[PDB]
Symmetry: D2
Subunit: 442 residues, 4 copies
């Protein structure tokens, strides 16, 4: 029902990335066009070759960390055909999911749900295209204002650069792997985001006695550490964390009301200081914390080792708390790197075949992608500043009001902790369609 | 969308009862007429003064016993505007329910959801109307029916004519035989409505007994201890213990909508064997969490006094009532108990009788048309699409009677529940209005 | 502490079997002898080479099915040195177990607890001894009265027969594998009791796409079916059950009071008709049922196959309900047997192994005592235990100071707890008073 | 354990007979028991019998410790003072087993400890409120203090009596912490006196009282939840300066800080490391609520929303991010007027009672020891307990046979478990060794 736009025509909207955030916009646009519920020239560019939701971390048994009611449509309109329940119905799996009695689908299943949603937009999604730059465009070269943008993308397979012109741009590119600055670059040092996809290529013998270290103590680290013990049953795994313990995520109901869609207005209207203080107070809802059930499972596995041998130093799988990595030796043809550990308080060494670095993500890559348009920001800004409707501030003497750039998923500091999650995507997709296409549709 | 039909015209369909079962049919009819998703002369008669879902058993804290996904539309079409989630959304309560993390809404909430659904059919529902007779209408062929109802407020008898009749009247209170008639002997279905009128002083040390060991008995026994803090309650059961309901996932696939075809297609012997094999999913069983809470309350009494006979609240297992003696409202009733194997006397202010329900009241209601059944039948026989067998030499092809909610023997344990209402509603609309709608 | 008796001497008590039931008797006799809580010529004969608790079913992740308070001593005396909590304390593990917040230890752990208890009685337990018969003894050439028994056992390693004389015998030999009669004998057909110990030797390549069927739908079937899926991650497993579904065990509190030690008195005093009707009413506590958590786990694995493929005939792991095996072709050099399946209401599989999880019988004491069954009173075809677990003997034939007790095979007279760990602590205490009371 | 005449020189006098002092009595009994392995000992307790926070024994409240952490098991599971042995003596062991819970009702755990305490009745004097600890010199002309005189007030008569002892244990728990700007008024009641004092004030269970609760930790949540059941027609208001009730951390790795053997590890860290560690782990106990109770309160709120979507009209409300700026409480009117402002760096409530669930202080031992604090080493203004809980004394002023020990107020040096039931069994054994080790050997 959403038709393609010729690559070389002037688009109304180009979205960089086709993860859940952009997909929720495609769904909301489809729904806003659906006569049952209530065409712009739109495309989406995605570097991956097909839709995939953190495929590097699709570990067996991993569960979504959101109730399925927070899918890409229900909180905006439960009648939408893009709800998780309607997806199940179309797959003939609705009653079977009902008998599961869980709000938390397997990540594999929620990925498939979103894949099923995305498949209905394949005519307007360009996969295998990595946006590399956004550059100013002027319909009249001697005009003093930019009135469109040219987005250049690199073909992930051939490296060819393609160009699309558009009035409006959405940046919804998720996060980039955050790595500790003192770790060297090495094929054996692998960020959590590439665990399932690259670690098997590196360590091909599942039964070989590898020594595998995991750095971190949030959800990525816990899932990898737990999974490694099953994926390489004879390995020796070491969880290295600078905290004293894995800590539980806060799933409690009053605290989690910060994720309600209608809280975005209130959070945004707060002073930067109150926003800073609020984000700090609620950081334990998602960051550096592990779902209690997974902590308890790991704790149980540790206990079973203790039953077999009371000396923890002799355990197959170990946790080294309050440690930090001070040096990595990684040169020469040998298989193992040497990891140097010191206390994380204000030496030990491990020989490892691979280091999984589960140290989280940054959400600042939009600043790099937009560097060739950052001269259009108002003087005195060194970061893009989104308004309540996610449109970034532009110097009006330099940019036409009909052109604009919106950010999605990197606005935690202005819009709250729900900004990078699935939590408010259904509602926000509806807001973005109104903001970007409201006049056009009316 | 569904418009009234004048009281005197020949209706296409008249449904007796407007509980969840008839409501699901109205919803599916609405949805089949809704252009987003893809008029017959229909009305409903309901004895209660408004839609109400077992209002006598709306005890504080009671939860519906079905995942909300099994609401009145979602399993048929999750896009329907009559889903529970859409209901929550229209109330501005969707996110708040989400933060609850339960599939099992409070019964008060699920009633309100269904009441919200029912309010959309107010033009075609006549409340406060108790159907009393279904009369043959006419050659020697019966081709319509007259449904007579008594107004609960005025007692006036009204007649409505219809080609087709749906009987969806739920169940009637099953009482142990031989009980005297006494207003203080109260079936569980009237607990919230009759006991507070009878026992008005919440702080008085009443003696209150409860008969039974299913979900109704447990809920009443647990609730009495909070409603009458100073009461002495006694749970009388002929089994040895409250037993947990089976919510295990493979067993509970018997409630799937698509199992109705498979169950129906079995022999009567296999259907009987199946119903007995799965009886622990719902009958004479208690949700484990409630069993454990009652058990904890009992243990705490043991902490205060090791002598169980001196407890405020007691359970008398493996007992049956041999008689309830009364000497007038001047004094307490005397309950005589003996072992239920193939003794005690209790003096009580009230007896709550939580002994379940029968689902055969339709045979009385249809007695004046039972001569239209095929010779040699003493019970109405519903087919897979719920239409009862009629002697075709006596009844026209344009007329018929359907039963809903009383067909466990032919359609499985889900028949009397909410479990398959969304899907069954769609089937009923097809079977009843399919041709009409295709034209 | 418990000192050995010279093997050729006349013992006060010989217990056949050193599983938890005999062990609980050893522990209770130790405690009765400790002046700090409050010696007979006692010995135990055990077939296995060391103490082991259903080692053939020590499946990874398996948990005990009793609260640890129901251990071998606590319910009789929480001060006993043989409580699970003291065992943990002696191991330096008490605080660490406490942080688990569970009442159900891993079976591997509970076995090690009982093994730790057992090792304290090594002086009176002879391992590797399979008792083969109990023969009557008449110490008076004039009197025709049996006043002792000679228990003969076959040494598992040497096959040599040895004889021990005792006034009193306890038979505590647990259960024998119950196999469907129509099933042929074949090395690829293994009872669940030999799963961990026999199946790996038969199916040695953990990564081969084997076809493995499991017969049954109780706790053993579910544990094996779920375990096979991790052990042989490429196998195609099939759960064959004659019921329509796996059904949850009843762990609800009022029902499980049937397992209370003080209930044995009330159960025993009932008519055989009521005791039969009671056992059938409460069979769901533990027979032909699966702990709910494990049912849901299996169901979730099944659901995940449905996500990837809607057609269940094509799943890697399948459940076939309401089926019975009518025939198993197993002759031939072919690696796989052919299981023929019909409906169980009143298709063929090609498999490399059939795990048979069809439960146990507790009738083996009948063969062991055949050479003394003539000492029973006239008109009994079964041994009839009294409340104190002593079997009835014709008093004109057996001296009062001689007797035979049965342990763990008395469900019919003593309740569903009889074969479990449930009342072992208290029953041990009663057995020591029944057997050694007068002597103490 | 047999009585020592009040006027004799004791070996040990314990101030308080709560769980901490009882753990020492139990460990002394066990050390004296030949099955497991007399000093002149005396306990002084203000209450008339053993009682474990009886002011907060609200219906349904649970102990927040696995029963394995009782007063003896972690030191010796064979002790007759274990929780399981108590159940066995009550004829209740199997029944508790069928509960499948590690967390007894507070009522039950209190009864267990009362059952333990009754076996020490000969050495506990109830109804005695200790008021001061005074230096003693068996030779008044000498310059060294070699005993202490403990003075207590009889609660019934008010008479002071004196007991002399070589060694003193202070194990007095905590005192109610009140916000300083709140006035003193019979309608303003600390959570510790909820069950004992609020019913006396509000006698009519059916009256539609307006009752506010200040705070958002476990006491505030338990009271807020209880009031809705005790006064079914009341309007209750939970006033908190946080934005939400937050869950307590019961995850297993974090909760290893409560292990007995971790006391050595915590104590052996630098003061800065101890401060940082205590702050990191505050969510295990302080200003947090057991998740299950939070979920129950949230569900009760949800039901109100079903009946009426406008939260201002709800019977029971939560006012987050608020602070009390003024209380009007003079005049004959029954209700006080509470003034609220944002807690961020006008609105009024009229209430019949304000329950103040703002926690406890643990400095009351400093008052009791004021008349001996000149015996500390020069340059100390706070008591410094060593690893074995004995406070530092100037050795040139105090004899080695005299000493003062503290229990339950030593979080800063010994960890979060110090004020709880967590390490009492093991610590009792350590305290018996330190105080009576030579004497018993
Ligand atoms: C393993 C895991 C880790 C998580 N970590 C975090 C986190 O640190 N913080 C947090 O609040 N949420 C995190 N979440 C929750 C997560 O953010 C949401 O589930 C969801 O992925 C957000 O959708 P999004 O579309 O904004 O981002 P994504 O799901 O990341 O989608 C972004 C898309 O943009 C594409 N893309 C990126 N760059 C380019 C480019 N230059 N050109 C073209 N396409 C591009 C990517 O391929 C990707 O498909 C995590 C979830 C998982 C499963
Ligand atoms: C407290 C409680 C007890 C339950 N007990 C049972 C049970 O024993 N067995 C079981 O399988 N299910 C039982 N259920 C599940 C229950 O049947 C379903 O939740 C649901 O009510 C079935 O809907 P229904 O419309 O088929 O019947 P009902 O909900 O009972 O609705 C039937 C309607 O018909 C009306 N009516 C009856 N007679 C007449 C008449 N002569 N004229 C006009 N109107 C009439 C009634 O007023 C009622 O509104 C129970 C549920 C609850 C909450
Ligand atoms: C995997 C598993 C399966 C179970 N299946 C059942 C069941 O089907 N039914 C049921 O009611 N309970 C069953 N249980 C519960 C079980 O019976 C108790 O946990 C407990 O093992 C009973 O102790 P017992 O000593 O009476 O028997 P066991 O633990 O069986 O001990 C019997 C001992 O006697 C030995 N022995 C046997 N014959 C001889 C002989 N001729 N000579 C010398 N020694 C001999 C055996 O080697 C064994 O060591 C099962 C438990 C588990 C863990
Ligand atoms: C409702 C509740 C609130 C709690 N609040 C806290 C808290 O804010 N912070 C925290 O870390 N722990 C708290 N806890 C945990 C608690 O400290 C332990 O459960 C346990 O009470 C500690 O025992 P204790 O004997 O050290 O103190 P207590 O149980 O308080 O015992 C101290 C005893 O000393 C007596 N006493 C006090 N002064 C004198 C005197 N001058 N003379 C004679 N006797 C005296 C008291 O009567 C009391 O019996 C709380 C527990 C509950 C149930
Ligand atoms: N919150 C809810 O949604 C809710 C609430 C209540 C009920 N329900 C459901 O409605 C259905 C009916 O449940 P129910 O508890 O009302 O009834 P029920 O399941 O039919 O149980 C009836 C109880 O009464 C006993 N009984 C029947 N006749 C008796 C007699 N003459 N003498 C003594 N005892 C007698 C029965 O004993 P026996 O056990 O010996 O047969 C049984 O214990 C159930 O499926 C239930 O789950 C749901
Ligand atoms: Ca939650
Ligand atoms: Ca239980």
């Amino acid at each position: 029902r959403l038709r393609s736009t010729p690559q070389d025509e002037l688009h109304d909207l180009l979205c960089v990335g086709f993860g859940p955030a952009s997909l929720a916009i495609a769904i909301a646009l489809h729904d806003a066009l659906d006569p049952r519920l209530n065409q712009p020239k739109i495309c989406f560019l995605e570097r991956q070759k097909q839709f995939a939701w953190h495929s590097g971390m699709l570990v067996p048994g991993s569960k979504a960390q959101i109730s399925f009611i927070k899918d890409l449509a229900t909180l905006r309109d439960p009648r939408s055909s893009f709800t998780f329940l309607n997806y199940l119905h179309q797959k003939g799996r609705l009653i079977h999911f009902t008998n599961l009695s869980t709000f938390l689908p397997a990540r594999l299943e929620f990925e498939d749900y979103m894949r099923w949603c995305a498949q209905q937009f394949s005519d307007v999604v360009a996969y295998g295209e990595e946006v590399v730059e956004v550059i100013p465009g002027k319909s009249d070269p001697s005009s003093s204002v930019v009135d469109f943008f040219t987005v250049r993308s690199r073909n992930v397979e051939t490296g060819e650069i393609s160009a699309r012109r558009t009035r409006k741009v959405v940046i919804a590119i998720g996060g980039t792997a955050k790595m500790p600055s003192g770790l060297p670059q090495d094929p054996r040092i692998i960020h959590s985001s590439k665990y399932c996809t690259t670690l098997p290529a590196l360590l091909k013998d599942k039964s070989k006695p590898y020594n595998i270290a995991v750095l971190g103590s949030g959800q990525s680290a816990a899932e990898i550490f737990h999974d490694l013990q099953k994926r390489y049953p004879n390995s020796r795994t070491t969880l290295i964390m600078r905290d004293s313990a894995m800590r539980p995520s806060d799933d409690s109901p009053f605290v989690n009301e910060i994720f309600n869609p209608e809280r975005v207005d209130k959070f945004y209207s707060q002073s930067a200081a109150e926003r800073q203080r609020s984000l700090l107070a609620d950081k334990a809802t998602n960051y550096s914390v592990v779902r209690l059930e997974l902590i308890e499972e790991i704790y149980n596995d540790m206990y079973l080792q203790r039953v077999k041998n009371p000396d923890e130093t002799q355990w197959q799988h170990r946790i080294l708390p309050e440690r930090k990595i001070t040096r990595v030796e990684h040169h020469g043809p040998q298989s193992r790197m040497r990891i140097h550990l010191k206390s994380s308080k204000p030496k030990e060494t491990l020989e490892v075949d691979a280091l999984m670095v589960a140290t989280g993500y940054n959400r600042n890559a939009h600043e790099r992608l937009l560097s060739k348009v950052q001269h259009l920001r108002p003087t005195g800004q060194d970061q893009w500043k989104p308004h309540r409707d996610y449109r970034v501030e532009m110097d009006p003497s330099k940019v036409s009001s009909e052109a604009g750039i919106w950010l999605q998923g990197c606005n935690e500091r202005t819009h709250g902790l729900s900004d990078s999650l699935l939590s408010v995507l259904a509602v926000r997709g509806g807001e973005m369609v109104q903001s970007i296409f409201g006049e056009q549709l009316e």
